[PDB]
Amino acid sequence: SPGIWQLDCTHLEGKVILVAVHVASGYIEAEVITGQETAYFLLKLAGRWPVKTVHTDNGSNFTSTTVKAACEWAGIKQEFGISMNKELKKIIGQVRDQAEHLKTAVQMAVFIHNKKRKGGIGGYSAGERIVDIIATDI
């Protein structure tokens, strides 16, 4: 399906970073932020992309009433079961000194990750590959 996503956390400078990965493309979305936050992030993601199954690898998202409500409102299947976060952190480090706010540095890192080619030359970036995948499916 073009709507398969993986959701995970990572931590950096004492803050928490939601990271969603489009499994087939490698495209990512992240935010520096609870259940209300995750639910808001999911709704925002689902209004932008086809989001029809989200995988997580622990239990935390199965115990949030608002996540479950988001889910139902948007038509997203929660599914259990499945590093990108360490590639992400390494770019965040390349740029950390270009912004005051970590969350700015996170978004610069997201930008680079989604716009760069694999190996730095040839082929489609994750950003092109998610759009390609979706444009083929419709």
Residues in contact with a second copy by CB under 8 A are: 29, 40, 43-44, 46-49, 73-74, 98, 101, 103-104, 107-108, 110-111, 114-115, 124, 127-128, 131-132, 134-136, 138
CB of 81 to a second copy, least distance (A): 27
Residues 6+ apart with CB under 8 A from 101: none
Task: Tell me how far CA of residue 79 lies from CA of 59, 63, 103, 110, 128, in angstroms.
Answer: 10, 13, 28, 25, 26
Residue with tokens 């969350």: 103
Among 11, 15, 73, 111, binds ligand R2A (CB under 6 A): 73
Is 49 within 8 Å of 134 (Cβ atoms)?
A: yes
Is 137 within 8 Å of 2 (Cβ atoms)?
A: yes
Binding to ligand R2A by CB under 6 A, coded x per residue (else -) over 3-32, reads ------------------------------
Q: Which amino acid is at 91?
A: I
Q: Does residue 128 bind ligand R2A (CB under 6 A)?
A: no
Contacting residues toward ligand R2A, per CB under 6 A: 33, 36-37, 39-40, 43, 66, 69-70, 73, 99-101, 103-104
